[PDB]
Symmetry: C5
Subunit: 337 residues, 5 copies
């Protein structure tokens, strides 16, 4: 009789689950059951360009109405043990573009079932997915990626189930509390639509994040070493022309260090058949240091015929090389920013 | 009687599963049950030559008839819960060449069961399979590979089960929309045959992709550094031979850099017993960058006898080495393309 | 009645579980059930800065009261086989910041169930969890980090369940015995509070450690080589200005070694965008060595026309560079202390 | 009664499974149950020297008799659904030297149960197992390994179970089609015996392969480059003793290239304490090139005071070094071949 | 009534398991049930310092007495199917210092249940456990480590369970059959005791191994290359000092090659906050080669003012450097042996 009577609530639940067919969706053979979805993103763990995928952790909650679960006489929202979820109908909601996802199970399966007097069911899961995000790296590291999560019903068509973002544009929360060390979340968008496969029309909810890659790490790691090596190569121009060994050592060391600057990129990137921006900058710097070495080679080659022309070429280079490199940096940074 | 009446539909389903035996195939003791199949390829995640295998995610659908699951009076197709598959007969379809595969299970098992009024079952799964693919790397990285997927009945024979592609060559979809950064899909084929083993004849469906590898990554990662190091080695010919330290440093550094490139390349690949094209090109570049040092030694040797021939050798080498390298590259690229 | 009468104990347990409903929490529809918690930390396996997480193995014990499990006639505590835990109600306690956690299952599932005559339940598990600890590296490697373990009830609000540290500050034991290879644990705090989400107010526990990173390793790895390179670059001041080759070689070696040391440090950390303290020190050392090299270049550029000026500049650099570098080191080590 | 009457077949199967005790082996307490085994090796995925194990995918079929499963009236072999294997007694066959083994489960568990009218059970699995193969690498890469797969009953002794190879020497098939890029299967053997442990005598089966390593990779990666480097080191003997730069450059380049060749293979093998054949050959070649360089050093040292002696040493080296290397090759390739 | 009568044995077993409560330990409320143990070590798969743990495979067998499992009239030891282990009480044995342990499950769970007439139960499992082992790597790679395996009862105190090594000091077998490529098992010990935790005393068994590392691999891969590079610097010493390029190249190449010695070995080593012996030896060798280079540089610097002093420096260097290196090797090898 009283809500504090445990046997009465047990009888209510047993009467709810008596004759319950988990094989049928609510309102079977009639209007489709509408499911509302919310996502509370705990964190985006990693964004791997090598595998071209991002790892996400979220509280994914679905909200629908099963009239078979409506109870009368209890003025409370019955939060039931998660195991009861094995005895109810739940949507066959899956993530279209995932590769490895699971529901956490410590200390129990991270899953929540809550029933409402009007029959409404709230079903929540803590899910860690690894969704595939195809990235265009033509502007790496100054690129801007768009990674999406696609949510769909696997077996039920639009005649049987319908999806919507419960709460409108505020359905997905926690985006502003995401710390990606190498990325920043420019924007996120929610999309709802229907897609027509050969088996019929299926609902679809899309959650898209536009990430922008930072630049500080690459400045500290790649661009500054290349600029400093190029300037060190320039330093040879003020050296006296007679120092053959010194200038050749300068050229060789600069070229080899320029080659070894970014060996750490063959492991952090996939195999792509195009030039990135970092490859363009490295190629330009290598071309400049190699041209400095060739300039000294020409100076040595024509030194004997004209002792003054070698000095003239050195004096011209002292100014021509820095100005040309500055122009190259200007066009490069205006193009990619 | 109306489909809106959920109790009537539940009665019909219970009648369908009343006395149903999951251990007996449809038409047990009779004609083999035809099981059509279709595949929708979501993506080809990776293709690896170190392991000689490719990962493939797909919607795999089986279409057959089980007259024990024939219901009358309902003009609808019953999309049942994914957990009803444990209470039906499903073909023991397996992938003959796979190594490790699984069915995605978030939020629930990615599985679809649909029944039809004439007792016809559609059974769909979402499967990520890592299938082996032996590769002929004799023409790597300009190689063209052929990777297959062999679908077979495990226990039942051709006297109990038959396989065919549902819809002919249109039975496999999504092939043209596969994003492979390194490869490109030239052609895909479908074959249906029977294979004889000691236990009898088994049905067999073969799906085949011909993959053409792209060259840009290796052009910008292996060939270009080798050409640059070869030119750097050539640089020593314009250095006057009295500058001993310069030429010694150039030769030693170029030889060591070529060795490093070769070591990286051979540590990025498995241990095949034949010769790869990239190995041939690296060996040719190594031969050239060692002939440069041996030419310096030749100059230092014939310099004892006559000094004019010492300079004549350098003058001739400045023309010979670029021309010989150009001819070598010409014949190499004309053969392997 | 007899303690040795195992049949009587079985009858008592069957009476306890007769009509028991695992779907209903103790005192359902009434006051929240106070679940006290204890943790015995066996070990912290590893603290990873690259993945920003730490692995923790612990004995996690929950302690609550269920009147349905109260028994009489047995003046003893019933330590039951852990497989009875599947038939009782247990809190849906989870860890908010974990990424991959499991319960050890050899030889049996590492689990303990103990029942007390008054109805008290003790429920112990052995858990290994990879908790995500976001780290700020602006002072690395002289940084003091704060890594937390958050404990929450997934589906029950504060109306249903309440968490507390059973024993106060002594609830978590074994912290002093943790042997971290790199860090040293300074302090740990236990915080009991409540949090608010759109679904209501949830209880929260927090076990926080403050870790002070040991400095000796990075002192002997990332600082001594830099200081040695700086002093070796200083040695170039005592070299006479006639020997251009030796001073050029010293400058080249010092600058390129500083760059290689920067890369060596970079090969050990994630791709954070901000500047670390060690990065600042490496930049300072590079500035000093580059200044020394440019000073030599200046002397060489004007030594012939102004030899006394060159000698005076060399002496003043000899006396200035150690002083300025020592001042820089003192101010740097004062800034980060 | 008819084979097409599925109800009669279901009745027969249910009658067979009525009263069946999965806890008792067939003919419990009487003569041991005879289990015959066949293996159809699909492929050998990899043979790893570092891990000392090999991966093996096979169709493993067991064949025994159980009178409790004998049926009459149906003159057909009943190929039952795989799940029925969970309701029958099956031998506790396990592989003694495996590390990680599993039965494939897509789209169903790759399991086959076939019953025969006399009670004969045929039980087939598709197992992928990584079995440890401790290798002897004292003759690597000219080694010849012997890798075995051991099959044993875990619980039942020879008083309760016996093993035999069903088919004699034709029990294992598919060996002739194994495609190992690096190894070739010289021979395979079948062994049957009993092994005595403290708990009694257990049946044992052994499937042995003798793998012979292909030498083409090591010929094209180790031996040929080493021979070429040794010859190019000999080349310096024809250079004049005064040409210190060229001869010392030749020596240094040859020695460092030999070091690189040694360094190459060390990353794909375990840390075995003994000496491999490649280690011996590379040690010999390194000694040869080092002796060439040291001979030039001695010639340079004694040239100023004893020029004719230096010329004699060069001339004698021109003969001794090729002769000694020929002798070393002869003895090395007689000992290891 | 015969031992070959299967239905009689089934009646006996059903009588045994009728009225059997798996939730109660044997002698509940009475004296603790002694549980003897044995281990048959199959192998030690790997030992890792990166994770500081070892993978150990064993047959772990438990021996206890359950009066409720006593059968009469059958003079046989009933070896039951492993599935019956799910219907029996088994000790809550767990390995205290493991990280990821599992039980092999092909072709069945590697599990043995054997019942004796007097109620005795033998329960055997095959377990692959990754046990944690903290290592003192100060004397690496000449260290002797001690790795343990701690076996303990989880939920039962010393008043409910007692452990003892069944057989005495011969309770663990197969130790001498363990083949570790890099380690040799000098000794193993068995310890039995009680540990007093907050909830009273708990039984504890400990199996300890001592492993002495094999020094041969590091001799063949680390020490010999460094010694050879030092001898190469000594070779550089003997060259006539007027050959600038030769000695410069030899010194620089030796320095760089010495810097690039244990790069492969550092990868598979931790970030331990102390210096290993290999690091000290490599630092000493680098110091020696750098000192050789500096000696030559000083000789070249002062070789035009006092050639008589430069010749003396070289004569004394040729004696001091080998003697100093030999003394360093003597003291190093005496300190760590
Ligand atoms: C990463 O990249 C993806 C694309 O690859 C972006 O996704 C797109 O986002 C835009 C919104 O920014 C989507 O545009 C909207 O699509 C809705 C659904 O379209 C379907 O249904 C309608 C009928 O309802 C069909 O006409 C249509 O063909 C589709 O089948 C529309 O309902 C939206 O319409 C809105 O605007 C129009 C005016 O433009 C109004 O008239 C409408 O009333 C309504 O307000 C709109 O067109 C687009 O569909 C998305 N693409 C895909 C493939 O889904 C991500 O946004 C991007 N990431 C980020 C962070 O931006
Ligand atoms: C990657 O490599 C694989 C092989 O390793 C290729 O697979 C082969 O594909 C070809 C088609 O391109 C297959 O050839 C076809 O086989 C069919 C089946 O043959 C079975 O049945 C017949 C009887 O009907 C038996 O005689 C035979 O032994 C088999 O048991 C045939 O029906 C096809 O016949 C076609 O051609 C003939 C003329 O030659 C016509 O008369 C027919 O009407 C018909 O048009 C055909 O022969 C071949 O069997 C496949 N091999 C395997 C092992 O599967 C992949 O194609 C390749 N990848 C790519 C992208 O090409
Ligand atoms: C690592 O970083 C974390 C934060 O990310 C630190 O955790 C914080 O720890 C402090 C304590 O050091 C916490 O502050 C404490 O909060 C308690 C709870 O207050 C909440 O709940 C009550 C109701 O129960 C509300 O009334 C209140 O508004 C809050 O919503 C308080 O009870 C504590 O009070 C105690 O201290 C104050 C003085 O500070 C006294 O006046 C009180 O009498 C009492 O003794 C206290 O305020 C803080 O909430 C924690 N943060 C989070 C996010 O949980 C870790 O400490 C840090 N690691 C280390 C090693 O320091
Ligand atoms: C890789 O290396 C393993 C060893 O590490 C090899 O395995 C051995 O193979 C040989 C055969 O080449 C085996 O020898 C044979 O054993 C059979 C079983 O005998 C059992 O029973 C007797 C008692 O009846 C016991 O004494 C014995 O220990 C066994 O328990 C015998 O039946 C065989 O008999 C043959 O020789 C005798 C004479 O000696 C003749 O009278 C017979 O007619 C017959 O010709 C034989 O003795 C040996 O047991 C295997 N050992 C193991 C541990 O497996 C692999 O062969 C090798 N791999 C390859 C590819 O060669
Ligand atoms: C790797 O390192 C571990 C330690 O980290 C070593 O393990 C230790 O091994 C030694 C033996 O070499 C153990 O010493 C023995 O401890 C036993 C247990 O003592 C407890 O229990 C008894 C009652 O049973 C109490 O009285 C006692 O106070 C303790 O509470 C003792 O029973 C043993 O006694 C032996 O010697 C005495 C004389 O001194 C005799 O009278 C006894 O009969 C008996 O022979 C002994 O003292 C030590 O306990 C182990 N450590 C731990 C933590 O348990 C490993 O051995 C090492 N690896 C290798 C290969 O050596
Ligand atoms: C609780 O409900 C049951 C079932 O209706 C009833 O028998 C019992 O008396 C109730 N208890 C109280 C205290 O009202
Ligand atoms: C729905 O079908 C059931 C089962 O046949 C029947 O008992 C019930 O009366 C039907 N409902 C209506 C409204 O006819
Ligand atoms: C089929 O078998 C069932 C069960 O034995 C029997 O009742 C029925 O009459 C049979 N029908 C035919 C056509 O044989
Ligand atoms: C085996 O024992 C059962 C039970 O006592 C009995 O019914 C049966 O007849 C016995 N078997 C034989 C062959 O006597």
């Amino acid at each position: 009789n009283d809500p504090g009577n445990m046997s009465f609530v047990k009888e209510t639940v047993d009467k709810l689950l008596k004759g319950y067919d988990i094989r049928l969706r609510p309102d079977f053979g009639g209007p489709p059951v509408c499911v509302g979805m919310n996502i509370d993103i705990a964190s985006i763990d990693m964004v791997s360009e090598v595998n071209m995928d991002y790892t996400l952790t979220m509280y994914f909650q679905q909200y629908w109405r099963d009239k078979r679960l409506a109870y009368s006489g209890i003025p409370l929202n019955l939060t039931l043990d998660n195991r009861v979820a094995d005895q109810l109908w739940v949507p066959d909601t899956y993530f279209l573009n995932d590769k490895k996802s699971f529901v956490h199970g410590v200390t129990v399966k991270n899953r929540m079932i809550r029933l409402h007097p009007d029959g409404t069911v709230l079903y929540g899961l803590r899910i860690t997915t690894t969704a595939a995000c195809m990235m265009d790296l033509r502007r790496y590291p100054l690129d801007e990626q768009n990674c999406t999560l696609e949510i769909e019903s696997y077996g039920y068509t639009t005649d049987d189930i319908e999806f919507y973002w419960r709460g409108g544009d505020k359905a997905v929360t926690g985006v502003e509390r995401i710390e990606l060390p190498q990325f920043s979340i420019v924007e996120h968008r929610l999309v709802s639509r229907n897609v027509v496969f050969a088996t019929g029309a299926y609902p679809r909810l899309s959650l898209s994040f536009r990430l922008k890659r930072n630049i500080g790490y690459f400045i500290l790691q790649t661009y500054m070493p290349s600029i400093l090596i190029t300037i060190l190569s320039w330093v040879s121009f003020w050296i006296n022309y007679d120092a053959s060994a010194a200038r050749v050592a300068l050229g060789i060391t600069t070229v080899l260090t320029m080659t070894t600057i970014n060996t750490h990129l063959r492991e952090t990137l996939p195999k792509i058949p195009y030039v990135k921006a970092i490859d363009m900058y490295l190629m330009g710097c290598f071309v400049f240091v190699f041209l400095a070495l060739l300039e000294y080679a020409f100076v040595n080659y024509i030194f004997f015929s004209q002792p003054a022309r070698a000095a003239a070429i050195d004096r011209w280079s002292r100014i021509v090389f820095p100005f040309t490199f500055s122009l190259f940096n200007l066009v490069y940074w205006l193009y990619y920013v």
